[PDB]
């Protein structure tokens, strides 16, 4: 399969909670870039109280001898997603991600 | 430059929360994504009488949305919001007092969509006195 | 003509509200489009008895839905509706008086098509004088 | 595959609150025009609480090498309509518009 | 000849609805059709004694349906039916009376099928 | 000999029931087929407690099924079964006495199956004397 | 088609209310006898309140140039059925029956 | 394909209520006939409050070079009809109709 | 087909309610044995307020010729099943059995 | 040895219930089969305070399963259960006192199996 | 730090239990697996106003997640949170007391996952 | 088919309780291992009032000669799976497990 598109793998630190100031301190991040292959779900409209939001899905597919990194988002094409589901057939890896929201 | 009671505390309310710096907002469009916003939901009017005029209260409800990670930001955001609504005394023929007794504050886990987010609803009572 | 109580009373109002100048209806068909108008659910009849004759109240309730970025202009028409429907004293054998004490506005935000609309409700109690 | 339809795509002007007269205040629009291909999903009977309404709903298409302009909502044949689901495979577009109504 | 007071009451508000000239049912069949029509729904006893008899109140609940674009006509119907019921003096080996104070009439839209419709909800206590 | 409260308000019941010649059943088997016939659904016991003995009441839920044209006989047998219950002053070991206030009869339209059905549901409050 | 069994269609009387008595009176009922296709749906076990029921389904179809004759319940093979839906496609009929129960 | 079932399409005229009277003021109908292709879809049983009822739905085709008239209800053989969707693929029409009661 | 497996059919006798002792009594059973066709739909988890159960289910097929005798239960490889769908097409018969507990 | 308010009750009823000679269960193991049994669901704890200590009430809910056709056996079960959580005096630091006013007994059929089932479902409150 | 009523008392419970030595949560992530645990779920506050003030109090809820064959540990735990902020005496800023007679303590079962586990719910109301 | 995985079966032992400590007492476990076939469904996301979670499945098939010992859980690959559903197709096996987490 034609694999031409990057995917960045991201971890985030140690996290802890601090009472006496009452917000939460974390550490630093760790990236990782790779290329995979990448095919797209459709973006949907979805009502909720608020009012209306656009969430979207993509899939990536991966080959034999290739190793995925611990991570907790990936990052592709400027917008983080965060994975639903994984299955790993016969050697191989399947990936669905849904888009989310991380702070700045 | 007169209008019902329902919207002028309405304008009011608004008024305040734009000039606090925060963003507010009425049914929140497609195109807008940041996470830190008010919104408003809706009034009711209650009536009691005398031999003089019809008068009662007005009740305003509104909420806050953020992120989960982020409750101090909104409980202080809530709390700005009830001080500020508090010094209301009276809009273009109106005389306005909130009614401490029965404003509440309640603190959530809203998961109605992919990122977990934090809601803190408001109740503002107005008594016509 | 004398009628029963329900009708009186909705075609009084039917009436106050067509000649105010808004578009009314009790069905709305499928051919008419155009979203500024009043609706008109149902009505409730009690009874209390005396040694002479029948009295009570009789319950209305109405709608009015628009488009949400105008939600002055549903103000203004339920508020108009209500001052209006205050001033009814006799009907062809009847004669009623409004009650103020059980008569309230609720506004909110209406999602049950694709176009985000503002809907208004309207609850009125007549007494039977 | 044939395009012969006309398609606009009409975008909003900036929006803000006008607290002392009540309204909403906002600006001009802009309109372009193309040629794609529609196919029509049938105009369905609902019921609703004030009476009885008319939906459709319409599937727009369209081959590489066009760029779709930025957008608020769509007119075809007079009437306009918003989308609902938005997909983008292999470097191509597809889009599903359902039915709105729009202040005149 | 002598029945139940659920019996009692059932035959004579159903003469009654008979004798107005309208068209009554207690479950209506499939190959009837006409929109303007009576159905009872159900009964309720309640009973309170003393020291000689049982006494009590009995509860009846009836409908009448027709098209939406005829609402008077409706409305007339279940004032009638109320008036004519307000009549009952006594049956055989009872006495009754109305409570006025608990009967009520509401009006409201029904769409459970392709024909939007209009129901008549009346709801009477009778005290022996 | 001696059961507890509810077996022996339950046993009693079930034989005047079947002393008057109606069918009686506690789970009606999938094999038999007939319309007219009784079942018998739960049992309630509160205590009211004194410094010599223990009391309260028994509360027996049961309904009688039918055939839709036929309302007058199962009105009827629910009359005879209240009539016959009504007659029930002790049993081995307890006495008791009918609460006449707490005691009513529902009639009603059941479709849960095929043949459109009438039902009439009874309550009887049993008050140990 | 081979048609061989036998299926009776059965249609009651004029029926009207006693108010004196409290009863239901009706009329006679006329018998119709024919021969057409039946096949089995099989029997299901539902539990309802008062305990557990059986009921049956059963399908009767016809080929042109025969008349249903109007009726209420049909009884086949010692067993009163009701019918529930009526498809008459190209000048045929068929017909899907469930079983009732008939006052002796 | 075979088309000759005859439709009728009926247009009613305007409506506004008398208040005084308490009643319903219409004006005359308009029907036009044509000559279309009808298929059936079957008679339903549904239980109601009040009781059971049948209800039926029918399927009318129509090729090119044909215009529908504005109408509101459709009489097909005696009975009065009501559409509940309405698909135009490609210069053609496709209409799903239902039955309902009109007032004498 | 291969029949080979054994089947046995179980029917309780007359049944009786004796007021003054409080129980149940009953008669003797009658059993029949054939040998017919089954085979394994699985046994399934099902969680209930108590806790966690075990049951399975299966199916008996005939083929003509055969006729199966009155019965309440069978056991099937010291089983317990009772009958949930009862079919019988074209002379023959299927049945969908599903397990129960039987008093000792 | 000495235990919180709720464990300690628990550890007594399912001790009494125990000693009667009936099987008892927290949560049904999938692997035990037989039907008559005794389950305890939950309990609820309530404060009342005075100017020395700290009291209020425990209320503690189990229920019997059975067959269907073994009425007598449940409801004997259950009434022995109740008599015999009447007598529970005091346990290792604490004082209690069975409340009778608030303690119910309801039968009813439980169709959630294949099987049908007869449950009686226990209500005990315990005052400290 | 003077902060708002609400987020006083959920820091002075949230250090409250980090000190007792148990793991604390606000919102489970994914990648922690280890069953016993505490987590908070909301909070409410009501006002009374008085001429020089504005009191009123604060209702806090958490609950305690455990394995279903480990009722002790969860109830323990439950007690021990439970009297630990029974000892809050003042904040910066605020003054506090615990209201005993409406706090209360609830053990049931939850299986919204394969694991069946053990849930210990908690009230707690504290007046300015 | 190709059976190179690895699969061992755990019985638990008997269990009493202790009404004087309020603690369970339980015995030793038996293990026995064996080499099967294993694939995988995936693992999926859910939200929970607590948090989030993650939960895997997996299918074991066996082919006829070999006998299943009884068990409560099974250990594959340093994760402890519980079965849900359980068929035997002509002397053959396939069951399917379901993760859960088990006290150290």
């Known amino acids: ?104 | 430059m007169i209008k019902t009671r329902d919207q002028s505390i309405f304008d009011e309310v608004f008024k305040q929360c734009q000039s606090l710096g925060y963003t507010t907002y009425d049914y929140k469009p497609m195109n807008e994504v940041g996470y830190p916003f008010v919104e408003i939901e809706g009034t009711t009017t209650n009536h009691v009488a005398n031999k003089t005029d019809i008068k009662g209260s007005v009740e305003l409800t509104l909420s806050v949305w953020g992120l989960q990670q982020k409750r101090k930001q909104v409980s202080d955001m809530a709390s700005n919001v009830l001080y500020c609504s508090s010094l209301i005394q009276a809009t273009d023929g109106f005389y306005w007092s909130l009614d401490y007794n029965q404003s509440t504050i309640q603190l959530m886990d809203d998961t109605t969509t992919n990122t977990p987010l934090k809601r803190a609803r408001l109740t503002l009572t107005f008594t016509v006195r």
């Open chain 1, 1 to 104: 399969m034609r694999c031409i598109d990057e995917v960045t793998f991201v971890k985030k630190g140690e996290r802890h909670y601090d009472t006496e100031k009452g917000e939460w301190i974390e550490g630093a991040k760790t990236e990782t870039v790779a290329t995979l292959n990448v095919t797209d779900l459709g973006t949907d409209r979805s009502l909720v109280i608020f009012g209306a939001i656009t969430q979207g899905a993509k899939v990536v597919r991966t080959l034999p001898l290739f190793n995925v990194p611990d991570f907790d988002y990936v990052i592709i094409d400027g917008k983080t997603y965060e994975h639903l589901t994984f299955r790993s057939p016969l050697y191989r890896n399947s990936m669905i991600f849904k888009e989310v929201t991380i702070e700045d």
